[PDB]
Amino acid sequence: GFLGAAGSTMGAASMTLTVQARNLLSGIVQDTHWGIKQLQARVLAVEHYLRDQQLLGIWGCSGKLICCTNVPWNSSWSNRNLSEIWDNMTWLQWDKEISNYTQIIYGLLEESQNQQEKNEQDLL
Amino acid sequence: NLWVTVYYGVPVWKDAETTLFCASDAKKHNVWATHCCVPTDPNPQEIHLENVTEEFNMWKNNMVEQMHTDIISLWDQSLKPCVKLTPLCVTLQCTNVTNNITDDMRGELKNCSFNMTTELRDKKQKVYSLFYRLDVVQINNKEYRLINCNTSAITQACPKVSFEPIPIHYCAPAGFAILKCKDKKFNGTGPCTNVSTVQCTHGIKPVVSTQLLLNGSLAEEEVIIRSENITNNAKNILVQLNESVQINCTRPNNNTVKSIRIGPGQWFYYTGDIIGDIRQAHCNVSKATWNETLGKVVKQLRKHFGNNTIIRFANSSGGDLEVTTHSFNCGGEFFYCNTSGLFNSTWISNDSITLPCRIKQIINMWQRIGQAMYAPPIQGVIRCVSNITGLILTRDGGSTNSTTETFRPGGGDMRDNWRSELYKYKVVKIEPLGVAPTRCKRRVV
Amino acid sequence: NLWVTVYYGVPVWKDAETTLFCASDAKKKHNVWATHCCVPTDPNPQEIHLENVTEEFNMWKNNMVEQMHTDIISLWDQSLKPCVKLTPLCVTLQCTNVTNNITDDMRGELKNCSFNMTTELRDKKQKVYSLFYRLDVVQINNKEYRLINCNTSAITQACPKVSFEPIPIHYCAPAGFAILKCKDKKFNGTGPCTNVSTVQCTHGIKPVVSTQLLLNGSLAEEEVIIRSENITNNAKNILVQLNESVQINCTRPNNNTVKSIRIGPGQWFYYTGDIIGDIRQAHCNVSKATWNETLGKVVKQLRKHFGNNTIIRFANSSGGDLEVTTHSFNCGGEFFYCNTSGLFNSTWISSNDSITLPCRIKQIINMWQRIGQAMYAPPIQGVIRCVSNITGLILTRDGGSTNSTTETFRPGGGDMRDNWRSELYKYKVVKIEPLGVAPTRCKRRV
Amino acid sequence: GFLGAAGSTMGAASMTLTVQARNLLSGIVDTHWGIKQLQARVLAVEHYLRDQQLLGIWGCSGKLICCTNVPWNSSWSNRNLSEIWDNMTWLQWDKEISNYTQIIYGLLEESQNQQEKNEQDLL
Amino acid sequence: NLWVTVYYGVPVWKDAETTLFCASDAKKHNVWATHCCVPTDPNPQEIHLENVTEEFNMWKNNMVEQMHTDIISLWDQSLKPCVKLTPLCVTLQCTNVTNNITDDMRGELKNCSFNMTTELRDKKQKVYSLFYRLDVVQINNKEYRLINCNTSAITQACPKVSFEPIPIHYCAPAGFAILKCKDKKFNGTGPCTNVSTVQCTHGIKPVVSTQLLLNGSLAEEEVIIRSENITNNAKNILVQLNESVQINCTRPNNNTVKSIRIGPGQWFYYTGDIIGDIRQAHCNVSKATWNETLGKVVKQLRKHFGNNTIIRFANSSGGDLEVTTHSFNCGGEFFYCNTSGLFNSTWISNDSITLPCRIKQIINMWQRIGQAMYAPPIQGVIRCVSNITGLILTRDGGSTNSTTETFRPGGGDMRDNWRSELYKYKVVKIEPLGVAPTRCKRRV
Amino acid sequence: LGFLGAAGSTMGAASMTLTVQARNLLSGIDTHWGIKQLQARVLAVEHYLRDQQLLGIWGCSGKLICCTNVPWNSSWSNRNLSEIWDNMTWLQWDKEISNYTQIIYGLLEESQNQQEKNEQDLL
Numbered sequence A: 001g002f003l004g005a006a007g008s009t010m011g012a013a014s015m016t017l018t019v020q021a022r023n024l025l026s027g028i029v030q031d032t033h034w035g036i037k038q039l040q041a042r043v044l045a046v047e048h049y050l051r052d053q054q055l056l057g058i059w060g061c062s063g064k065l066i067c068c069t070n071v072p073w074n075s076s077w078s079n080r081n082l083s084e085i086w087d088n089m090t091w092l093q094w095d096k097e098i099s100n101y102t103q104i105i106y107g108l109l110e111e112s113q114n115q116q117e118k119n120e121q122d123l124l
Numbered sequence B: 001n002l003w004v005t006v007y008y009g010v011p012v013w014k015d016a017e018t019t020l021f022c023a024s025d026a027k028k029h030n031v032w033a034t035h036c037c038v039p040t041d042p043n044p045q046e047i048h049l050e051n052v053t054e055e056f057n058m059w060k061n062n063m064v065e066q067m068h069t070d071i072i073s074l075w076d077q078s079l080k081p082c083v084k085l086t087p088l089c090v091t092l093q094c095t096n097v098t099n100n101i102t103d104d105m106r107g108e109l110k111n112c113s114f115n116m117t118t119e120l121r122d123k124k125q126k127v128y129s130l131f132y133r134l135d136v137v138q139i140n141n142k143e144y145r146l147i148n149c150n151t152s153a154i155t156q157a158c159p160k161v162s163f164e165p166i167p168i169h170y171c172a173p174a175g176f177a178i179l180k181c182k183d184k185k186f187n188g189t190g191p192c193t194n195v196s197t198v199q200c201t202h203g204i205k206p207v208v209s210t211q212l213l214l215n216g217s218l219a220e221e222e223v224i225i226r227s228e229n230i231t232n233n234a235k236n237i238l239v240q241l242n243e244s245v246q247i248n249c250t251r252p253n254n255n256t257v258k259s260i261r262i263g264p265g266q267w268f269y270y271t272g273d274i275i276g277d278i279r280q281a282h283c284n285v286s287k288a289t290w291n292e293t294l295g296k297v298v299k300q301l302r303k304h305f306g307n308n309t310i311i312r313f314a315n316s317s318g319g320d321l322e323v324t325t326h327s328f329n330c331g332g333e334f335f336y337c338n339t340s341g342l343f344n345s346t347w348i349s350n351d352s353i354t355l356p357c358r359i360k361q362i363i364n365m366w367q368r369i370g371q372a373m374y375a376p377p378i379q380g381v382i383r384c385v386s387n388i389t390g391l392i393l394t395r396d397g398g399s400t401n402s403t404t405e406t407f408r409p410g411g412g413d414m415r416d417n418w419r420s421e422l423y424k425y426k427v428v429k430i431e432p433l434g435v436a437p438t439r440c441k442r443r444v445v
Numbered sequence C: 001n002l003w004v005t006v007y008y009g010v011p012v013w014k015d016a017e018t019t020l021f022c023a024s025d026a027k028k029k030h031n032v033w034a035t036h037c038c039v040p041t042d043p044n045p046q047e048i049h050l051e052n053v054t055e056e057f058n059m060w061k062n063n064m065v066e067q068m069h070t071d072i073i074s075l076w077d078q079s080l081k082p083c084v085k086l087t088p089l090c091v092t093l094q095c096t097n098v099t100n101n102i103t104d105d106m107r108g109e110l111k112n113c114s115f116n117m118t119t120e121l122r123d124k125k126q127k128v129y130s131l132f133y134r135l136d137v138v139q140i141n142n143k144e145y146r147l148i149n150c151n152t153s154a155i156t157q158a159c160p161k162v163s164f165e166p167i168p169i170h171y172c173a174p175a176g177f178a179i180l181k182c183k184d185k186k187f188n189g190t191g192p193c194t195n196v197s198t199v200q201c202t203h204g205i206k207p208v209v210s211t212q213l214l215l216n217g218s219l220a221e222e223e224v225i226i227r228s229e230n231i232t233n234n235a236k237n238i239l240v241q242l243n244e245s246v247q248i249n250c251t252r253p254n255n256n257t258v259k260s261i262r263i264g265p266g267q268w269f270y271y272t273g274d275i276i277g278d279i280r281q282a283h284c285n286v287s288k289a290t291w292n293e294t295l296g297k298v299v300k301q302l303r304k305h306f307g308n309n310t311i312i313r314f315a316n317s318s319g320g321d322l323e324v325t326t327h328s329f330n331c332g333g334e335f336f337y338c339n340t341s342g343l344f345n346s347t348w349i350s351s352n353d354s355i356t357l358p359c360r361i362k363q364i365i366n367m368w369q370r371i372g373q374a375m376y377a378p379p380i381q382g383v384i385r386c387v388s389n390i391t392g393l394i395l396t397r398d399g400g401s402t403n404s405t406t407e408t409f410r411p412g413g414g415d416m417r418d419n420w421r422s423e424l425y426k427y428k429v430v431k432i433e434p435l436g437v438a439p440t441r442c443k444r445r446v
Numbered sequence D: 001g002f003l004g005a006a007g008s009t010m011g012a013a014s015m016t017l018t019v020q021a022r023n024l025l026s027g028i029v030d031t032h033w034g035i036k037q038l039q040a041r042v043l044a045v046e047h048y049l050r051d052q053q054l055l056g057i058w059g060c061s062g063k064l065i066c067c068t069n070v071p072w073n074s075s076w077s078n079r080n081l082s083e084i085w086d087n088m089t090w091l092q093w094d095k096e097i098s099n100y101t102q103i104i105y106g107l108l109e110e111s112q113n114q115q116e117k118n119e120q121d122l123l
Numbered sequence E: 001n002l003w004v005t006v007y008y009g010v011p012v013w014k015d016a017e018t019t020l021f022c023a024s025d026a027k028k029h030n031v032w033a034t035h036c037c038v039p040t041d042p043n044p045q046e047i048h049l050e051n052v053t054e055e056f057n058m059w060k061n062n063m064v065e066q067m068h069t070d071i072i073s074l075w076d077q078s079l080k081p082c083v084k085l086t087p088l089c090v091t092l093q094c095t096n097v098t099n100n101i102t103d104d105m106r107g108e109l110k111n112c113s114f115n116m117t118t119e120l121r122d123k124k125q126k127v128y129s130l131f132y133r134l135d136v137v138q139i140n141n142k143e144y145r146l147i148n149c150n151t152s153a154i155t156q157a158c159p160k161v162s163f164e165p166i167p168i169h170y171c172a173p174a175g176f177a178i179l180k181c182k183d184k185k186f187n188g189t190g191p192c193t194n195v196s197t198v199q200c201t202h203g204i205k206p207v208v209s210t211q212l213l214l215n216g217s218l219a220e221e222e223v224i225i226r227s228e229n230i231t232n233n234a235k236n237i238l239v240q241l242n243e244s245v246q247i248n249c250t251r252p253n254n255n256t257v258k259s260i261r262i263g264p265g266q267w268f269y270y271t272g273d274i275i276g277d278i279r280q281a282h283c284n285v286s287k288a289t290w291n292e293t294l295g296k297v298v299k300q301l302r303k304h305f306g307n308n309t310i311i312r313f314a315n316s317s318g319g320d321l322e323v324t325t326h327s328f329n330c331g332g333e334f335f336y337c338n339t340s341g342l343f344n345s346t347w348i349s350n351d352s353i354t355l356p357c358r359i360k361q362i363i364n365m366w367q368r369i370g371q372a373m374y375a376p377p378i379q380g381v382i383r384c385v386s387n388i389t390g391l392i393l394t395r396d397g398g399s400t401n402s403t404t405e406t407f408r409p410g411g412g413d414m415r416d417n418w419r420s421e422l423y424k425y426k427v428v429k430i431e432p433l434g435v436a437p438t439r440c441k442r443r444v
Numbered sequence F: 001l002g003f004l005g006a007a008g009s010t011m012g013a014a015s016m017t018l019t020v021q022a023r024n025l026l027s028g029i030d031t032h033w034g035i036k037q038l039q040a041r042v043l044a045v046e047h048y049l050r051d052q053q054l055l056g057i058w059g060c061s062g063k064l065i066c067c068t069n070v071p072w073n074s075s076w077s078n079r080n081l082s083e084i085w086d087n088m089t090w091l092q093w094d095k096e097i098s099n100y101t102q103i104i105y106g107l108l109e110e111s112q113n114q115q116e117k118n119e120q121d122l123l
């Protein structure tokens, strides 16, 4: 079920990421002012879906739910043991723990992929 | 050693304010049912969130604000296609009804007449009708006018449109989820540890009332007392009962409804006459039950104020009828009942209570100026039975002295009637992209 | 050989028309402009200079102008919808002249009218006395009169609590679009501009409404700039943007009393009941020396297109009823129609004084040249004064003739579009088109 | 910054593709007023999706830089790499080959269909 | 050895209900032209399909319901800004117009006088006008009121607005397509093996009438008779024709129209007076043409009801004028013509038929009780010529197996007229995704 | 051919026209009138995205044709492969498997769910 893994550890939660993805659109697909409000709700849901998909594309992650990238992890963002992070901590806790650094990480992911694509075009 | 790894489909969320839509579970010409057209047929889902702790705050809950706004809209929209009564704002000639009137109703009904227009603009007819004194004011057999002729246009509500409350379920739009607090004794502001996710709320019946809360949910363990700031006076206290108090309301006479044409297809309904000796409207509560459910409130108030304090009840302070009395819609008519007999006792550590009531047809609804409505009279005898499931109380004075504290029934905003049901729900936005450290790297160069 | 390569995110664009949205600085609290333009602007202009980019601009074909003139005329109506209708006021009036302590100039301008108005209750009537300007009242045939619009339209009273005072308005592009700004110091409104930058919103432009003379706009950089779609075509107007501000001081000298009655439930009508002291005409003052220097600067710029061996003569307007024959403006809620002939009398051949312009005031206003609707401007109580900066003029030519070396210019004006062009001439809207194709040496590997 | 590369040469501008790609969609994220704004939002989305679909059709999905199997035709404007990439800007270039837009798009679509069929037949 | 393969862009579809948009080929005061503002392409670009069989059912076609609903909406929007004639529901004093009247029309016109409002609220004016008796009822020189005073406000239709039908086209939104049946004998309820796909329908004129359908398409090879349930007397029979019948309708009097302000910019138009002797309205149908046409219909009715079956035609059974007579509008005027002269025959095995017509000005429409429209009078003389391209018949009797059946004209529901031009079209949704077996696997 | 021009063609033959139909959903796209048209436009977008998401989840995001990791079941159909590709068209075929849609889709998601997991450990 949707968010069934919300209290699960980060590692365990990743076992079924798909349920959180299919329900971003299936829940959309399944008085004048009332009509306008409903259109705003539907349009916004689409716009948010697309934003996230574009970011993954820009960062070099396409149809995968999990992508490794080539940006090094900074100990200045977070410096903790991987065993705790993946086995004894949940994603809700984790998101709260590193919510400061999302803007910088995203910028770095974008730059790395941009350089990679140029290098690949030259190497062909 | 390790790099950034991106995960999509991460089961996390943040607080958010969005637009919710309503849904009915399926009578004809029911306003609520007509509007909340979306089926609630799919099984309600509920996913318990094991080991999830979340913070709820009913006083900053925007589900309440939306429900309030949606309700106002339904009333506006429903009264949009109904007969306007502008042509009735004329001088009335009125005398008192003195025939077979009990003392309690002396001076309450007036027999008025006026020269009204009809379909053909050049013609007029004399109309006789009965009005309650609360709807009529004196100008200088005396001359009177309808009470809203100086402030507001009046629209007659359509007799075929029913506003009877039905359960309504509020549902999240895609991208959002509703979290429910299941803790047994939650006071409205703080962490909740037994939580789950649902796609819609349970049904909430949009009952509109003042002072006493009718037909709501009951508490499961005990009477629960909630407020924004407990020791701060001039704040409403919402009391949720675990056992209800039955209240029986009635209008005992047989009213005869007549009608005339004002214009082309524009009908006006009014009380023509009254059959039988005249008696006042009233509501009954069992006396013993009322005393038992008051004692429970008193125990809980002492937990907050001290075991050695004295709790004194008193009636409302004064002001407009809407807040000084208990208002409700019974059988389609608007009642304003005197609760002075309910909040009279002092608590120190087959009988019933009859509350007299008044009926009013010109209603300035939702604490607004302008947009007045006229409630058509209902033919016959009115009777309804309802459950008191809670109270709106205020504490006042703020004195120390003897430590006796005084509580009074309060009026309150209409928002408080929904806050009392929506206290267990919160709306959050889902955010699928997460980032975390790990030892993998890509191998394409 | 070379191969086709596809790139996404290519920084190119094409001219486009799209709906813009209205934004404000989001700081009175009962102002139509502020109420409508609910979106706050970002305090950071976020301007990106486009180094080595040349772009052609055309102010006479600018869709931004057209939108500004569909927004103002839809905004004005939604603000008047929830207000008092004065159809109960369209009754026969019994009127005499106001002759007590009146200056010569006002002898026939103000009338004392009496009529039978409705009351809260439909069966009653009340006698009302009020004063009207003659421009609002016509004779029917102590004589009988009617309000001027009883034969064409309903009159809606503007709500006294709603201000229409212009505030700076920012027009902002929707996503996928960008606004290019022309920064060349002396751009004559058409053609290539080489100092170009990209912005998200325009600067704040105040939607000031006027006719022959512009008010409270921006100033020209360096010299006075004269812009016209076609100088040769005398059917077109010439927009002159002054490089310095010429100040005008306008007054409505009488101290009046505003009274009100109910027409019906919840509905109040406002009118002028009394005037205290001597009755005097409205006046606008402009410095005489400043005005003569201002025209001389305009004349030199006009000469660039006509010759320096000619005569430039100014003259007053003709035709156009009251609306294009006067300088119209709104100060304090009063609508002034000033006589500008005193400003355009000079012939140019190659403290101290003020030029005083008498003005008339009227309360029943037709606006945006519509004829099926009208507004009643409630009177404002007390003596009214305002000041303003001209920042530009609208001129037209009389026409040429056989063997004439004298160019004659008159003040005039067309629709409101001219006033909006004056501020929007430097902005252009384009659509961004990210897909590009080019040749290269990279072949897709298969 | 967005479009700061507009005056840069085609080659130099190739490294700012992520700025323009992000700007549209992150930029995306009274009855008549409400309708007009919804229409504007819907169009921004429709345009985004058409470009993405088209890249998918050509086999360029997920990439900002894509090499294809359509050769450059001598019919289309023919100029040296030394001027196309090193001297000209994208604004100039787009005008130079504006005619051939539909021709190129049709060729790209056909090449991708044949390649996908060939992979399935080989499997 | 086989695995499932996913394919996208697959040429398949499912039946669907969607909203079609209206488009029209490029005066400008016409309501249809104004509403269907979207231009059509000069080339419809129809694609034939080969080896495709589709099942059509016109009776459950939702293109018909949408067309009906959109028409109602357009009429209501068109009248939104027009004058509300509430000041006219006053007592009228009326006498009969007796001068210059033929026996026909002897009691049809009345000369009414009333006190109407003026620009100013303090004045009244006396107005004289001529009304048709169908719009005026006695109160009890007698006192009268307008027929709609006790049910609705009457809105005057704006004289500058034209309701003249212009062919319009219904077009599919993206994701949808319109399938067309090109079977020459198709009867509305079954498989059609000759089909094509279009995005827009042919232009259809939104002509509103009962009994005899005007200015529609003709059958190409033979008269086609269509019915949902042919043996059920509760259903209407829609008879198309393969040859049209020309009908000539006039209003012979030369009317002089006058107008008065009833308020601040609000004008009321009325009949003024009449030039020439008073004569009635009428329609001419050639008798020979009519009999040939009807004989063809009878032959085919026998194909459905038996070779020895006698087919008798008769007039309508009764009810409101709207449903008992041939209601139509031409020249902008509203006509109610008798069909008793067309259906008076029994079939066993230049002589025009003149149908008397009446004119009505206060029109209820679409059977909505609470609405009313006042059609302003038209100056001068009215003439129109139109094509009868089909009939709506309501057969009855035969309950005793008498071998004689009776066919009467009828049906006040406009939906049946819209059905007649949409029977060949169906709307489907395109479904591009699907899964099929193949000899391949996704290799890792 | 053109859009749906392959409607009666064999399944194999029609497989080369997939891009015509694939592109048309987007390339082809009174207060209440405006609202109804706006609703229609929003809905077309939602359907487009729904199908694209399913293809993404199943591991076929960039292709018109994908072999998968789910075996063909005898539950779905027992007809010859040659009758399916050479004799029938897509309309006729689709009618034979009308209620297997939900099971196949669930199986396809599961194959992706397992297939992508191994890569993170390998990297």
Ligand SMILES: *[C@@H]1O[C@H](CO)[C@@H](O[C@@H]2O[C@H](CO)[C@@H](O[C@@H]3O[C@H](CO[C@H]4O[C@H](CO)[C@@H](O)[C@H](O)[C@@H]4O)[C@@H](O)[C@H](O[C@H]4O[C@H](CO)[C@@H](O)[C@H](O)[C@@H]4O)[C@@H]3O)[C@H](O)[C@H]2NC(C)=O)[C@H](O)[C@H]1NC(C)=O
Residues within 6 Å of the ligand: B028, B029, B160, B162, B164, B165, B207, B214, B215, B328, B329, B330, B331, B332, B384, B385, B386, B387
């Ligand atoms: C708290 O909750 C209670 C319980 O739901 C509410 O009480 C109900 O109130 C409604 C509305 O006033 C009552 O509904 C009326 O019932 C009449 C028939 O009553 C008999 O038949 C029913 C059959 O189901 C029995 O249950 C009932 O006991 C009786 O034997 C109808 O005739 C009424 O119809 C009216 O409106 C329609 C509108 O379309 C008209 O056509 C009709 O002619 C007529 O005017 C109506 O449906 C209901 O009976 C009450 N229930 C009980 C148990 O008494 C309280 O009102 C609620 N509290 C508050 C404050 O709202």
Ligand SMILES: *[C@@H]1O[C@H](CO)[C@@H](O[C@@H]2O[C@H](CO)[C@@H](O[C@@H]3O[C@H](CO[C@H]4O[C@H](CO)[C@@H](O)[C@H](O)[C@@H]4O)[C@@H](O)[C@H](O[C@H]4O[C@H](CO)[C@@H](O)[C@H](O)[C@@H]4O)[C@@H]3O)[C@H](O)[C@H]2NC(C)=O)[C@H](O)[C@H]1NC(C)=O
Residues within 6 Å of the ligand: E027, E164, E165, E207, E209, E214, E215, E328, E329, E330, E331, E332, E383, E384, E385, E386, E387
């Ligand atoms: C079935 O189809 C036929 C057509 O095939 C329809 O009949 C036509 O109906 C239209 C509309 O009523 C008629 O058009 C009108 O003609 C009037 C006379 O025009 C004459 O002069 C012009 C040249 O100027 C010639 O082209 C024309 O043939 C005539 O000789 C006009 O006066 C009318 O104009 C109206 O609007 C203008 C607006 O500016 C006003 O100024 C006018 O005063 C007036 O109010 C209009 O153009 C057409 O003539 C009819 N043809 C036939 C053969 O009858 C049927 O009505 C249709 N059936 C049904 C049921 O709808």
Ligand SMILES: *[C@@H]1O[C@H](CO)[C@@H](O[C@@H]2O[C@H](CO)[C@@H](O)[C@H](O)[C@H]2NC(C)=O)[C@H](O)[C@H]1NC(C)=O
Residues within 6 Å of the ligand: B246, B247, B248, B284, B285, B286, B352, B385
């Ligand atoms: C409200 O009305 C109900 C009846 O509709 C009352 O309940 C009845 O009371 C009598 C007298 O004690 C009993 O004989 C009946 O058996 C009861 N009937 C039911 C259904 O309970 C009830 O007491 C009234 N409530 C109040 C507060 O007056």
Ligand SMILES: *[C@@H]1O[C@H](CO)[C@@H](O)[C@H](O)[C@H]1NC(C)=O
Residues within 6 Å of the ligand: A074, A076, A077
């Ligand atoms: C990330 O690492 C750099 C050193 O390369 C350091 O300067 C920076 O501060 C780190 N990030 C944070 C959040 O400090």
Ligand SMILES: *[C@@H]1O[C@H](CO)[C@@H](O)[C@H](O)[C@H]1NC(C)=O
Residues within 6 Å of the ligand: B096, B106, B107, B108, B133
């Ligand atoms: C009529 O009733 C009013 C109260 O509404 C009362 O004050 C008054 O004295 C009564 N008059 C008579 C004559 O009964």
Ligand SMILES: *[C@@H]1O[C@H](CO)[C@@H](O)[C@H](O)[C@H]1NC(C)=O
Residues within 6 Å of the ligand: B186, B187, B188, B189, B190, B191, B192, B230
């Ligand atoms: C209960 O009330 C106290 C006192 O106001 C408050 O501190 C606490 O957070 C509330 N909530 C819970 C869950 O205890």
Ligand SMILES: *[C@@H]1O[C@H](CO)[C@@H](O)[C@H](O)[C@H]1NC(C)=O
Residues within 6 Å of the ligand: C092, C094, C114, C115, C116, C127
């Ligand atoms: C008001 O009506 C009365 C009616 O008797 C009339 O005499 C009087 O002159 C009217 N007053 C005005 C100002 O028109």
Ligand SMILES: *[C@@H]1O[C@H](CO)[C@@H](O)[C@H](O)[C@H]1NC(C)=O
Residues within 6 Å of the ligand: C051, C052, D005, D007, D008, D009
């Ligand atoms: C503009 O041209 C100069 C050379 O004259 C060059 O140095 C500069 O980088 C160019 N600007 C851009 C944006 O490429």
Ligand SMILES: *[C@@H]1O[C@H](CO)[C@@H](O)[C@H](O)[C@H]1NC(C)=O
Residues within 6 Å of the ligand: D073, D074, D075
């Ligand atoms: C290349 O261009 C020529 C001239 O326009 C044209 O005839 C030829 O068909 C083109 N090549 C391809 C593969 O279409």
Ligand SMILES: *[C@@H]1O[C@H](CO)[C@@H](O)[C@H](O)[C@H]1NC(C)=O
Residues within 6 Å of the ligand: D094, D095, D096, D097, D098, D099
């Ligand atoms: C296309 O070719 C024409 C000449 O045939 C040329 O003028 C044009 O600039 C080229 N590209 C554009 C801008 O369409």
Ligand SMILES: *[C@@H]1O[C@H](CO)[C@@H](O)[C@H](O)[C@H]1NC(C)=O
Residues within 6 Å of the ligand: E095, E096, E106, E107, E108, E133
């Ligand atoms: C006037 O005409 C009607 C028919 O419409 C008739 O019933 C009535 O008797 C006539 N009255 C006169 C004036 O004879």
Ligand SMILES: *[C@@H]1O[C@H](CO)[C@@H](O)[C@H](O)[C@H]1NC(C)=O
Residues within 6 Å of the ligand: E182, E183, E194
């Ligand atoms: C099918 O219908 C079309 C109509 O466009 C016609 O041209 C064609 O000959 C017909 N084919 C047959 C014989 O079914």
Ligand SMILES: *[C@@H]1O[C@H](CO)[C@@H](O)[C@H](O)[C@H]1NC(C)=O
Residues within 6 Å of the ligand: E187, E188, E189, E190, E191, E225, E226, E227, E228, E229, E230
């Ligand atoms: C039309 O044909 C179908 C057979 O396809 C038949 O079932 C139906 O009854 C027919 N309709 C008529 C003419 O009654």
Ligand SMILES: *[C@@H]1O[C@H](CO)[C@@H](O)[C@H](O)[C@H]1NC(C)=O
Residues within 6 Å of the ligand: E315, E316, E317, E318, E319, E324, E340
């Ligand atoms: C049908 O014709 C007969 C002829 O005698 C007539 O009496 C009857 O009233 C007509 N029916 C209708 C509805 O007009």
Ligand SMILES: *[C@@H]1O[C@H](CO)[C@@H](O)[C@H](O)[C@H]1NC(C)=O
Residues within 6 Å of the ligand: E049, E050, E051, F005, F006, F008, F009, F010
């Ligand atoms: C229809 O079937 C015939 C064989 O009878 C075949 O030749 C033709 O190509 C088919 N049409 C289509 C569009 O596949």
Ligand SMILES: *[C@@H]1O[C@H](CO)[C@@H](O)[C@H](O)[C@H]1NC(C)=O
Residues within 6 Å of the ligand: F073, F074, F075, F076
């Ligand atoms: C279909 O697949 C299921 C596996 O989920 C299997 O149990 C069943 O036997 C299969 N059916 C056939 C007959 O292929």
